[PDB]
Amino acid sequence: HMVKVLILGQGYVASTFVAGLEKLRKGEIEPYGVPLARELPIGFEDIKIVGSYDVDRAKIGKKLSEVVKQYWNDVDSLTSDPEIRKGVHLGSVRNLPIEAEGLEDSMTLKEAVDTLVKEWTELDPDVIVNTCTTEAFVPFGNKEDLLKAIENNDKERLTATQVYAYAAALYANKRGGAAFVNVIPTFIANDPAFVELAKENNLVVFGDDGATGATPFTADVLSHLAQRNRYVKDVAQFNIGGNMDFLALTDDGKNKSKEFTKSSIVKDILGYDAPHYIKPTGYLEPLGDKKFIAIHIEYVSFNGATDELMINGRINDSPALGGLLVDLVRLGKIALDRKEFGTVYPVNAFYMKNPGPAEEKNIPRIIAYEKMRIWAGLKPKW
Amino acid sequence: HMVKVLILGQGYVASTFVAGLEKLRKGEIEPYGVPLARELPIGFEDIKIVGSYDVDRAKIGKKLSEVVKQYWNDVDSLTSDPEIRKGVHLGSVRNLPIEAEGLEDSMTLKEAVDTLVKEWTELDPDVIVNTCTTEAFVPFGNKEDLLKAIENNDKERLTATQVYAYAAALYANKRGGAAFVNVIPTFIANDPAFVELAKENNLVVFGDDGATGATPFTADVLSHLAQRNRYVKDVAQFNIGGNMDFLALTDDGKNKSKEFTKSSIVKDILGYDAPHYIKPTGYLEPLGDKKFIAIHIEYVSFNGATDELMINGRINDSPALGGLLVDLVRLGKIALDRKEFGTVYPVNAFYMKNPGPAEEKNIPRIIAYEKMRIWAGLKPKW
Amino acid sequence: HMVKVLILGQGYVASTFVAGLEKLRKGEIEPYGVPLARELPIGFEDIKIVGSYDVDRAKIGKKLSEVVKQYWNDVDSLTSDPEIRKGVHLGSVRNLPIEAEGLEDSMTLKEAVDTLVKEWTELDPDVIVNTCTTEAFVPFGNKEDLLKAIENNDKERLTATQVYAYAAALYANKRGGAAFVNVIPTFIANDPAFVELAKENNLVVFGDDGATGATPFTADVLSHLAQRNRYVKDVAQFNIGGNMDFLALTDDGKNKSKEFTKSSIVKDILGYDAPHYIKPTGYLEPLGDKKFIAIHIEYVSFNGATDELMINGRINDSPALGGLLVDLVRLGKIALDRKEFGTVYPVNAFYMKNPGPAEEKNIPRIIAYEKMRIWAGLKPKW
Amino acid sequence: HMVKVLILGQGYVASTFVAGLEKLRKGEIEPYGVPLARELPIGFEDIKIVGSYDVDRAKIGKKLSEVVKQYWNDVDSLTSDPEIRKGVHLGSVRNLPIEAEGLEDSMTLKEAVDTLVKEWTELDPDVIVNTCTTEAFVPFGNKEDLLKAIENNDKERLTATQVYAYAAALYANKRGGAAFVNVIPTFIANDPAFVELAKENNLVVFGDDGATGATPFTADVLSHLAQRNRYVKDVAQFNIGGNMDFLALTDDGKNKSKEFTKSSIVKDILGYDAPHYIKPTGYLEPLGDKKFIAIHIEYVSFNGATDELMINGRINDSPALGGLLVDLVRLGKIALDRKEFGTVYPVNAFYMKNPGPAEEKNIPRIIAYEKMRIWAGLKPKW
Ligand SMILES: NC(=O)c1ccc[n+]([C@@H]2O[C@H](COP(=O)([O-])OP(=O)(O)OC[C@H]3O[C@@H](n4cnc5c(N)ncnc54)[C@H](O)[C@@H]3O)[C@@H](O)[C@H]2O)c1
Ligand SMILES: NC(=O)c1ccc[n+]([C@@H]2O[C@H](COP(=O)([O-])OP(=O)(O)OC[C@H]3O[C@@H](n4cnc5c(N)ncnc54)[C@H](O)[C@@H]3O)[C@@H](O)[C@H]2O)c1
Ligand SMILES: NC(=O)c1ccc[n+]([C@@H]2O[C@H](COP(=O)([O-])OP(=O)(O)OC[C@H]3O[C@@H](n4cnc5c(N)ncnc54)[C@H](O)[C@@H]3O)[C@@H](O)[C@H]2O)c1
Ligand SMILES: NC(=O)c1ccc[n+]([C@@H]2O[C@H](COP(=O)([O-])OP(=O)(O)OC[C@H]3O[C@@H](n4cnc5c(N)ncnc54)[C@H](O)[C@@H]3O)[C@@H](O)[C@H]2O)c1
Ligand SMILES: [Cl-]
Ligand SMILES: [Cl-]
Ligand SMILES: [Cl-]
Ligand SMILES: [Cl-]
Ligand SMILES: [Cl-]
Ligand SMILES: [Cl-]
Ligand SMILES: [Cl-]
Ligand SMILES: [Cl-]
Ligand SMILES: [Cl-]
Ligand SMILES: [Cl-]
Ligand SMILES: [Cl-]
Ligand SMILES: [Cl-]
Ligand SMILES: [Mg+2]
Ligand SMILES: [Mg+2]
Ligand SMILES: [Mg+2]
Ligand SMILES: [Mg+2]
């Protein structure tokens, strides 16, 4: 009862996943932050990291342990310690102080994909996890346009995550099945082009955008208010932190993807589009990995009364998502074992803040949780 | 499709219920804050106030409208405008600047009860709502002890709500069925003595303690955290407001009832008794009916990370509960129509912060909501 | 002991100033929010509004009262009720849903200025108050460049406030003295070109940017921390509201003026430039005139300990500044009476968040307050 | 340029003072949290701990280092490491899980005092610091009543701090001068009996109650609001933490001292007694030494507008006060050198939240700071 995992993008999230998982297999900690903890048939010792890819010249060729220790100084070794390999960069790190290298510097995208597939066939992952830098993306919608983009080496059109998910389908087809977990904003689970390519190629997809940070807290409050028929007048959410990833996109890149990165959480939960201010995380270096959040919601109660809630928080970013990933990789192996190719909403609805497919929307997360337990073969919690 | 309602204790909650309901039947407002809004077969025009009782000499003999306007100056008339009648005081207002009068000043408790029953038989309510001053109570547990307390005129042992619920059972028996809604802390739904007396006497009981204020918000956050297996280190809740009721109990009365008024919300939701500070509402006069709340929760996430949430709010007390009551009276008539005597957990679990019976506990309120919709004959919301 | 006041830009601030002042002369309210209240020799009845200018075609030609009632419905008349006159628009309202008209549509800037001066000589104000829409400005630094900009009709170079302050100096010279109060961000007090033009032309200038909102609260906390030698690690400030003015500037206009609109409050108060996030107010329509603010500051205390403060607030924008203006117009008449031409730091330091001249900086506002009292001829408060 | 210091009560504050001071003399840290840092003529290496007293049987006879390491595990040695000596207990620890021992178990109070004085004459402190458990005290007002209480061995009347301050005066007289720093609530600086005894016996007194925690933050906001003539409607302050000292007083002891422990900060700063809720710190064990605070203030601004501020914080208790003590001991030696016997308001006003003498009150702390710098022979900061 094992799961082999390949990581794309060896940064803070990835390194916290690895370091946390090491402590969990070494019993140095309890699985707090891992929702399903030890309830699944796959134990923490049964999760094996078979590979890690990056585009940072400072990381490529280092052992996984050397990079993980840069984020978590207490990690001096790892049970599986593969060397970090070169991926495909496209535009990912163009705005960051990273010296980039990529397969597609010396070959076409189509060639780079075939090269990835060959490498991955030897590493043999069950689950590929995407923790790459946030991207100014535009979805395809039609598979034919994705295929043409690859065929024509259309680098200006594609993002790295789009190329990696494409490669994952080709890999899945050659391997007889695999899973791709997309915890970044780029539409994969929510792009019907990729859901169709996945269904056709023995690939399970979870996505998109890991459910951490302020937005899930806003959504929880909105769910409360909806139940009580309290009319939500406005919602303001502020989120700021010190991770370099928050500077990844130019104002232009943000403008280009805004149509797709805008949250639908408020209308999803309330049923009406209450005015809201929900934006990308701002940058302030000394906060490091621990975000400051501030949320303000005002609403109308009975007899014309008006109430206000102000939520503030300090939340550790990478650990939150790292813990979710411990479940998502094990759930990916279950979905693969069951041949549930395409995207799996019962999983996405709980773990993702933009749950795929495009035709499904966010629900209250307690409801999502109970339905996800049932999908996983567990009894509900309450 | 009608419901006749009798109110016990004509103060802020009661008067907001009445004033709000008047605007709702007059279409001057939408039913925000009324969870089931217009989904029930009983409409707002079909709720008739047939009586109101108090012990304040300043209120007894006034028209309901004259008292309601003291709380909501915009109310200049009411569709049903009964005169406020004298109840039984026992210790209720002993610590407040209220000149008290009570039936039991001129007769025994047993006589006072028979007098109430005779009055109520002429007013003919379906539903009796208890919005009296908070009480230093001690539950009975065994019906025999409740019966002996009444029989022996044991005024030092009993609170007003205990005497009123007893009277409600006798009334229910003479009438062929009625309902008693207890939105104050005193155990009625959670006192097996009263649940048994109710079952035997054609009385439906909802209780105890209306689910408003800070505690339901704390409970919602705890539910979120539990789902994610986040270990809750501590919970602090502060609540303060300007309502006279917050001064009702002496330090001694508080000490006497503390065993029973202590929240179990934290252990109920989490399954372990995380250290917590959750206390009665403090007094600060200029806040009036709009409470200030402050909640702090710290918890452990993945890889030993520690996060913190600080929730602040300004919430209008009496409107919140007033809106719940618009549903509870209609649900009481449904339970009565169905002959569901004793206490009804599917209702209590959503509307009450100490849901009866004593053998049931709090659950996440979204789960309670969906189960309450099903009980009411509605389709679930999400 | 009188002061005649001319308003430039008849919007929310201006209209709250007028409406508030009307209630103060009519004794309908106490001067809360007016720092010096009734301590000055000029009473509220002695402040006369002699004129109001706008560029909104919907406002030009209306009585002041008709426009004020749009903001404060309780105002049905005014003691002085002049018709709103046409100003100069330049780029002010280009990004707003306002149909603009301006003198410079039919004449050169130099001509428009001479026209303003002639109009103002008949209205005869002592004090001109600038409450116009926020502007993408670039200061001059050298008076010669300001003069050339006017002479050459260089509309692309100038903002309305720059043209109005220029006109104010010419007016002051013809009149024998006047004062210009700049409560918007555009550098006037902090542009040596204008300070020199003012000194030479019998003009007193107060500026720049009224001291209201979140920034003064952040500054107060920083002052506290500085005193205790607490090392400030980071400062994050979020501010959002529903006023149309918050949409006045494009991303480009913001980029153009950012060099000058960036706060120096943190380094001014602390002496070192702690990392900070302090940005323009964001837009969320239902908040209206009542801003939501959120501030987070973390700092190092003794023995390596680290503390955190989270401040949230709801603050009414236009009333705050309206109240300051009641003092600033009276202080302007005192400065004029004393012939203190140029800019007056003892006033600016308390009332303005970028106190002029360019060579002076922010100080703790309690210190500024006591020095401002001394300047005004009052005894200090504590 | 040296100062010898004796500590009364070797708990969290005391141990943080010692541990912090050790790091400061060893250059392992900068003096953050020490307001006057290195501006005084006495450097950190020049502060010598000559003694430490307790009543805990678990601490008496231990080296100072062994006790300090229980609070700060990083401390493995101290430059001066005296054995902890037995004090006088009276009622101090009666409500805590501490096995108490005291001189007055085997002798009268008068004898116990003479014994302390003899011990202290050999240890030879310049400055005695009182960091003992909070006490249910009642001040004397008249010195004659203090003298009679000691003479008559009136243990039920006296607290430990009262006996220690008395002993300090007798010690000061025998030594030719000393200083007593009272950072706990018990009136010493604010009890004219002790101020007179001190003046007569060559004793300098600083007191009372160290200026840390939520109250100084509330006071800072109030000072801001007062300046702007904003009318404060209400002030609510919540403070909770995990230190055992918060359980020191029974409800009865709290009732007995309430007349004296009630804050006057609001009226002191505003000049009118705005309704307020400011209470002793509540207990929640897992918070440890890091308090959670919540403050809510609502106020009236211009034109009838109403604003609200909600401040939340996590603040490390013992470090805050520990840092103040680094200054207070050096300032005590300066006051002693100057023969300024009695109490010194210029010091108290900045460092203490109930600044002595009884005839002086709190002022804005920035004003207190500048006056304290002037007293100390420094130039003001801004
Ligand atoms: N709680 C969270 O941290 C959170 C929540 C939801 C989503 N996310 C998303 O997760 C992603 C990772 O976040 P992070 O904080 O770890 O960021 P990070 O910058 O620390 O790490 C990103 C890593 O990806 C590498 N990389 C960039 N482009 C790549 C490419 N084309 N191929 C291979 N490697 C590439 C970078 O060099 C870096 O090592 C981001 O997209 C972020 O938006 C994070
Ligand atoms: N959101 C909320 O307001 C909220 C929430 C949960 C529970 N409650 C509970 O609801 C109750 C009512 O709250 P309120 O704010 O309306 O208080 P309130 O003081 O305004 O009104 C109480 C009324 O009951 C009357 N009364 C007191 N004892 C009585 C007796 N023995 N018989 C008849 N009348 C009596 C009083 O004179 C007064 O008119 C309290 O027990 C409170 O704890 C309130
Ligand atoms: N608390 C506060 O409201 C606050 C604080 C500091 C500064 N300010 C500044 O005060 C100014 C006014 O704020 P507001 O909320 O009243 O905005 P507003 O949009 O309500 O009013 C601005 C008015 O100026 C008019 N106007 C625009 N350009 C003009 C021009 N060139 N000549 C004459 N009239 C012109 C507009 O038509 C409108 O009537 C803004 O610059 C704002 O940044 C406001
Ligand atoms: N920021 C702060 O910690 C803060 C601020 C202001 C005031 N204070 C006050 O400082 C005092 C110390 O606080 P703490 O947190 O260090 O408490 P603590 O309980 O950790 O330490 C108190 C110590 O005093 C000892 N003690 C008790 N009675 C004594 C007696 N009669 N003689 C000698 N020793 C005695 C105890 O055994 C213990 O070692 C308390 O009065 C507290 O109210 C603390
Ligand atoms: Cl999270
Ligand atoms: Cl977020
Ligand atoms: Cl949710
Ligand atoms: Cl509520
Ligand atoms: Cl509450
Ligand atoms: Cl819940
Ligand atoms: Cl303000
Ligand atoms: Cl602001
Ligand atoms: Cl300041
Ligand atoms: Cl502090
Ligand atoms: Cl405190
Ligand atoms: Cl202060
Ligand atoms: Mg979707
Ligand atoms: Mg129960
Ligand atoms: Mg300046
Ligand atoms: Mg005093």
GROMACS .gro file of C-alpha atoms and ligand atoms in nm, chain A residues 219-220 223 363-365, ligand 7:
model
    7
  219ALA     CA    1  -1.616   3.128   0.301
  220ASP     CA    2  -1.687   2.968   0.640
  223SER     CA    3  -2.179   2.990   0.500
  363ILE     CA    4  -1.997   2.451  -0.141
  364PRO     CA    5  -1.971   2.498   0.238
  365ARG     CA    6  -1.655   2.315   0.333
 1535CL      CL    7  -1.720   2.707   0.399
   0.00000   0.00000   0.00000
